[PDB]
Design a protein around this nucleic acid. Structure first.
Ligand SMILES: [Zn+2]
Ligand SMILES: [Zn+2]
Ligand SMILES: [Zn+2]
Ligand SMILES: [Zn+2]
Ligand SMILES: [Zn+2]
Ligand SMILES: [Zn+2]
Lengths: 98, 176, 381, 87, 150, 176, 151, 97, 87, 378
RNA sequence: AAAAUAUU
RNA sequence: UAAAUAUU
């Protein structure tokens, strides 16, 4: 049981550029290189300058997907993606190195 | 005891899947240049009483050998599954059986064209992407969000005939 | 734009017939299956009550294969007269497939009032163990279907050209190697279906009495064995027999010799060059001179085959047969004579003896000893 | 296991839990972040008021409903279903 | 690394968890003939014997070592035993799967012709196996094709 | 003595459209069993220096004659429209030209299948409607709403190759 | 009366009775003087074919020599071409039977442009002269429709 | 034209749902049932079953057919949807459209 | 000519008129049915009241907008856009 | 597993080569068109710098036709060397189409340094006026050299553009008859004419000659109409005797025999009356005369008429044949100044030169007429 | 027989 | 010089 205020946060705070805040476990963000490097151990909050709220929601869902199925290699399920969101999702992934 | 054996993992497949595999591999070995460099041994080129063929795929200095078998008593009551497949990875005397999904991952690592490193930058600048992945079976694991987004925005190629996929060959159709 | 697949033609064009039915045992690019058929009632040989041509693709779906289409049609067309005995004759470019053979077996077992004869231009996947088992279960077995299978000869090709081709004011012109291909296919199919002689034929021919009469043929029975771990293992697949093809205007003008037919079929076994094989032959008459010369040449070229000839009698003419035997032996062949043991083995393996025992004829041992002495003298002189 | 997202007043938490876990366990889990007693903290589903004691099975929700690629959405309140942003 | 791969991985679709397998040969034949010829083949060592997991498509096929040809050196002992228990057959088969060496162990009851099987790790074969080939395979399997073409 | 002429109506078409018509007419005359009874005359079976073919479609007493034509100088600058088509309605002495749409409505009076009298009922009863119209050019006019609704409920048959139609033969392409 | 009513109140043949611009098409590619000379010669001799097309449609009128048709067709009405009424115009008169109704197509072409105008008019003379049964047969063929007729 | 007189320019058509449209007499003449119904003293029509939307669609068909009763050049399409096709078919059958 | 639709108080009238016809002519046409003076009556389009003096071209409507299969829709007022029925 | 239409190969299978290039003048179901091409600098007798095969359906779109695809590839390949002149050789099963012929004309008129030779197994739609006009514009106008394929070209294609292994070319049954029929039809289409020297040599009525070992035949037809004769401008041409050849005809056919072989193709109406006028350097021999007599008896409609420049009498049987010819109705005459001039102006590319009569033309004509006249009645 | 996309 | 859906 980790408290976000403490060093061993166990739930890093993400602030969407749009204005929405999510929170996700430390390892889930560790799967993303930029946040991994940023989190430095004395900080527990990351703010995004350009990523929309929906983009950050989808990348968090992707973190969940990857951590759930990083080791699994059997009958992987589908991960929704749409053309209208695809370009900005690619940009966000490049920024976060997903 | 006192009678030795050799032990192999044999995916029980249908005969129609086997010849479809044979047709596709030869097609891309002769009609198209895609599978050029692959070898295909006929049934009479191996002493094994059961081996029906052998597709050899050079992977750099190692090799990937896909074998089919005939006359196995394992055929279902309706003979839905009389024949079988096995994937091997041989390097000199060393050898190891391989899973169909990892087999295609190792295949696509060398032979079929795929999104180059420039794909990300070209998509960022809104430019047309080429070359692009055409063998969807080489990325059947959980790929990086990058690749999933790229595959979403720009569709993969659909070759005709489809490239030989080891996963499609050994997919459990009767058990679904 | 492009019309739909046509599968019920009435007759096929001359180029089509010449292309599809070319009976080379190993033909590629013939991705289509043609099935001419005739249906008639039991009684005096009369005009067929129906006859058409079904067409299909080898890589299509089984329900569309020509054979399954015919059986689907028959299952309905038969309902008109449930008390009618039906003889069906197929002339097909490719032998039915494994699944279709099994389905035909089930169909024919279900219907006990149908007699199916099949003539095949070529054998389709004749080297597949599963297909061989399916053919054996369909034809070889004397129960249920008793479907008969045969290779197409000049007569059947001519019948098709007359009745299943738009052959207008023209006569059938056989392609080059029709007889050789026919005999190769016949030997292979007999090897598959495990054909065996009737007892009377073996009793009549394989008599070792030195003085004989009225026997114008030569019979050859062959088996093969493989070398492994200093042991000879019988290739149960390689086992059969054959008889000389007498001269015929349509077939071989100068009838081919059984030895030459055997040497023509050996190459199709695709024996390994790096292994060692032993081929054992039992012949009713000793090789002639030309045969023996060829056989010696063949043995010289093929270093992986060790030949073992056995003979029930010696056929000698001009003394040149003795020369032929001398050159054959010098080539490396092992020539011997058939004794009680060999006669019994041939009876057990190559005859439809119905479990019966061997009944040696009179003077067998004395004749065997005399012929052994004769062969010893011939090889030593 | 099922992954779930809780949303309220432009705040969110992504967290995994078991199937047999009851709503009491959910409030206990969110206690680690919200720093408020769980007895009062109130959950909502489909604009419906969940009772203080509420188990997954009697709720009817299943692992099919809540997926990593489509987690179930539930609101939170103390003592406004805010839609996501748009392109 | 091999032990870690065998321990903390989803393995080949044939998990180390014990699973029920069955003998599939002679599917059609009456039961008595099936079991009789099973015992005969197990005693002989001249034919092939196959064990298929009930719920999947994977199966283990034992071929006589003479069929393949040139014998492969076996630092580990594989066997089919009919002696430890009267009414059951023990099966031990070493293998290399996805680069990690394992031993597939199992047993089949003669009366039922179906039994159980499990997959155990093998450290012994690991150190003796060549480092060059195993390192090459480890390098080859970790890589991916995306964004590597220059 | 002044010259004498015969006056006819010709529709400028492309040689490719004439070819396809020929193909369709032949096909459905021989390969199929639909257009049986259609008579076709080759280019050497008529003395006219320009005629290319004549398709006769007996309609009871009357006869519909569709003719194509060769070597008309009227061809366009790019020779988009060198050839020509015509339709005539011969009965005894009398003859007359006809419109392409009226010509398909005339041929579809006796030749290709259409909703039967009882076809409407099955729409309400939920049964299967048969026969269904396979030639949609024979109803090019505005018909009763019952037929339109029935056609909307059940899609028309699409035959391959399409039934030959005078409309599709003599439709405008250059400028519409 | 029915024929006249149809002509007056029908969408007529796709070739409306209203005046329409027509032009001569032969020898498009050749220069204008050659085209003019060839058109005049074709009109005079009566040996070649001459075709007049509306500008905006694919319909055109072909004047084949009556000899090509083989058996000369009886002509109760006269078809004619004037090269005499005006020096610079060529006039045409073509009796035809379009969609079951007999009409006269009239028109003029200026030879310099080899173009001009044409119109359709109802033909009263031959309507009663033509056979009776055939006209009603064509009218019934034009009225019936396959829909819901077969039993 | 005046609606007070029985020979009005249009005719009342009350829908089963309880909705009234009005359509020209000449347009209605295209249907046998209404043609026989319109009797010259009456100028109203009551439909037991036709829904309001079905009535609107059938009236649209009358308008289309009267507009293109004679013309046969570049005839426009008549959109029809399966969800309404069956009830429109029943309405046409009743009205002989 | 174009066929027009008027939509008010559970009534509708079907009539063909010239494009150049002004709203005054439309009111004259509907007077034959409504038995009311043209002056006070006001039309509506896209839930927008139409002035006493207006023309089709000024409104921007064209013969393409009003078709024999999809006529232009306009409401009416005297001194509620009722939707069609449903299956 | 239905690969896309393979429109290019390197060599074709023997069965394909035999089934497609079989050159019957009226052949059906050869829906594909094959085109084996070679390119080479104007320097002769050196290995070609490129040679391949393009194939395509007839009923496809014009851009997929083998000719258009070859020109599309050639336009790009030509930019490599703009200073080099090229010769291109085609061997095509079906003859190009009208559109393809026109567009090839345009393409080659664009390029002033590319020569094109074409060989055809069969003529595609050889009885369509526009195709005839298109070929006339493409070939004769002056460079596209359209020819028919003979034994030599067939053997060349078999050797170079087929996978045949240790195999020798085996001509089908009627190869020479079909070749000569196609040659005659192509000559009729293109409107070939004799060179002045050839006619001057081969049409001397002078009884004493040297080297007269070849027989010519210049034909034309006339149709009945309104009790009048109308020239069928299609039916005009000439031909010469084919010498015996080992691969061609073992016993060379006589020009008259080729004429009788081609006449049936014209599909002359059985209910129409036709007059066939012929001019020949030598009078028909006995076998030719018998064949003409039997053919004319068989054909009611045809009416043959023969004009000759010399009377070929040998062993006296020819005069006997003339009697049966006359009984059949074939009128035989001699060539006078008027007919000599007509042949010169009609069947020679005289370039507008007027006929120049030789010495003793009238006297020789009178002598031949005197020799011929008595035989028939006397 | 083939007048030729009659898709054998 | 076909081991065969390498659909020329
Ligand atoms: Zn890829
Ligand atoms: Zn089959
Ligand atoms: Zn012999
Ligand atoms: Zn219809
Ligand atoms: Zn072309
Ligand atoms: Zn001669």
């Amino acid at each position: 049981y980790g408290g976000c205020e403490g060093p061993d946060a166990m739930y890093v705070k993400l602030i969407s550029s749009d204005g929405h805040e999510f929170i996700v476990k430390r390892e889930h963000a560790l799967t993303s290189g930029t946040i991994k490097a940023m989190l430095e151990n004395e900080t527990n909050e990351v703010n995004f300058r350009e990523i929309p709220s929906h983009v950050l929601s989808k990348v968090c869902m992707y973190f969940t997907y990857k951590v759930r199925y990083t080791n699994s290699s059997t009958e992987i399920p589908e991960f929704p993606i749409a053309p209208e969101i695809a370009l900005e999702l690619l940009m966000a992934a490049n920024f976060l190195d997903c | 005891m006192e009678n030795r054996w050799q032990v192999m993992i044999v995916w029980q497949v249908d005969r129609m899947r086997i010849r479809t595999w044979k047709s596709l591999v030869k097609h891309h070995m002769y009609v198209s240049g895609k599978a050029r460099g692959w070898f295909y041994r006929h049934h009479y080129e191996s002493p094994h009483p059961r081996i029906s063929s052998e597709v050899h795929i050079p992977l750099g200095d190692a090799r990937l050998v896909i074998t089919t078998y005939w006359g196995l008593h394992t055929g279902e009551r309706d003979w839905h599954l009389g024949q079988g497949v096995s994937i091997e990875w041989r390097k000199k005397r060393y050898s190891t059986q391989v899973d169909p999904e990892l087999a295609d991952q190792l295949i696509h690592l060398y032979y079929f064209d795929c999104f180059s490193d420039s794909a990300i930058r070209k998509a960022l600048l809104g430019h047309i992407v080429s070359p692009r992945c055409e063998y969807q079976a080489g990325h059947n694991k959980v790929g990086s969000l990058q690749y999933l987004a790229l595959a979403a925005l720009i569709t993969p190629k659909k070759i005709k005939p489809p490239l030989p996929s080891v996963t499609k060959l050994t997919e459990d159709r009767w058990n679904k | 734009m492009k019309p739909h697949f046509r599968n019920t033609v009435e007759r096929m064009y001359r180029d089509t017939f010449s292309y599809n039915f070319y009976n080379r045992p190993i033909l590629s690019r013939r991705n289509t299956v043609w099935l001419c058929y005739e249906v008639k009632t039991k009684g005096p040989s009369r005009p067929p009550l129906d006859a058409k041509i079904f067409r299909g693709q080898v890589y299509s779906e089984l329900k569309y294969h020509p054979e399954m289409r015919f059986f689907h049609w028959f299952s309905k067309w038969r309902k008109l007269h449930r008390d009618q005995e039906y003889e069906v004759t197929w002339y097909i470019s490719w032998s039915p497939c494994t699944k279709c053979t099994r389905d035909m077996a089930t169909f024919l077992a279900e219907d006990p009032k149908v007699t199916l004869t099949i003539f095949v231009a070529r054998l389709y996947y004749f080297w597949d163990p599963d297909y061989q088992e399916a053919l054996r279960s369909l034809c070889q077995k004397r129960d249920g279907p008793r479907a008969t299978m045969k290779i197409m000869n000049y007569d059947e090709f001519q019948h098709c050209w007359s009745k299943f081709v738009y052959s207008q004011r023209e006569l059938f012109e056989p392609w080059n190697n029709l007889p050789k291909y026919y005999i190769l296919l016949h030997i292979m199919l007999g090897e598959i279906l495990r054909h065996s002689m009737d007892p009377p034929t073996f009793t009549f021919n394989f008599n070792n009495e030195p003085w004989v009469r009225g026997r114008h043929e030569t019979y050859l029975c062959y088996e093969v064995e493989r070398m492994h771990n200093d042991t000879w293992v019988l290739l149960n697949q390689r086992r059969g027999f054959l008889c000389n093809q007498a001269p015929h205007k349509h077939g071989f003008l100068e009838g081919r010799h059984a030895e030459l037919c055997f040497l023509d079929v050996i190459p199709f076994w695709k024996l390994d060059l790096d292994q060692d094989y032993r081929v054992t032959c039992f012949t009713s008459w000793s090789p002639c001179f030309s045969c023996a010369q060829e056989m010696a040449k063949f043995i010289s070229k093929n270093k992986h085959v060790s030949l073992c000839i056995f003979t029930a009698r010696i056929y000698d003419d001009q003394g040149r047969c003795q020369e032929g035997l001398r050159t054959l032996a010098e080539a490396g062949a092992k020539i011997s004579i058939m004794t009680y043991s060999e006669f019994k083995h041939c009876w057990d393996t190559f005859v439809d003896h119905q479990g019966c025992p061997f009944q040696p004829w009179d003077g067998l041992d004395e004749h065997s000893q005399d012929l052994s002495g004769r062969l010893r003298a011939i090889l030593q002189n | 296991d099922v992954f779930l997202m809780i949303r309220r007043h432009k705040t969110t938490i992504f967290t995994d839990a078991k199937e047999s876990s009851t709503v009491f366990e959910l409030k206990r889990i969110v206690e680690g972040i919200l720093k408020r007693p769980p007895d009062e903290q109130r959950l909502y589903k489909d604009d419906q008021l969940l009772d203080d004691g509420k188990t997954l099975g009697e709720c009817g929700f299943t692992s099919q409903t809540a997926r990593p690629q489509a987690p179930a959405t539930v609101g939170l309140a103390f003592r406004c279903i805010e839609p996501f942003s748009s392109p | 690394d091999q032990r870690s791969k065998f321990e903390n991985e989803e393995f080949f679709r044939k998990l180390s968890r014990e699973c029920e397998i069955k003998y599939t040969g002679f599917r059609d034949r009456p039961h008595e003939e099936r079991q009789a010829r099973f015992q005969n083949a197990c005693r002989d060592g001249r034919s092939e014997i196959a064990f298929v997991a009930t719920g999947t498509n994977l199966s283990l096929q034992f071929f006589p070592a003479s069929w393949q040809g040139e014998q492969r050196q076996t630092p580990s002992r594989e066997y089919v035993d009919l002696e430890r228990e009267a009414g059951k057959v023990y099966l031990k088969a070493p293998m290399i799967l996805n680069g990690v060496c394992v031993i597939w162990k199992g047993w089949i009851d003669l009366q039922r012709l179906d039994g159980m099987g499990c997959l155990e790790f093998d450290e012994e074969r690991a150190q003796q196996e060549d480092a060059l080939a195993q390192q090459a395979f480890e390098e080859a399997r970790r890589r991916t094709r995306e964004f590597e073409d220059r």
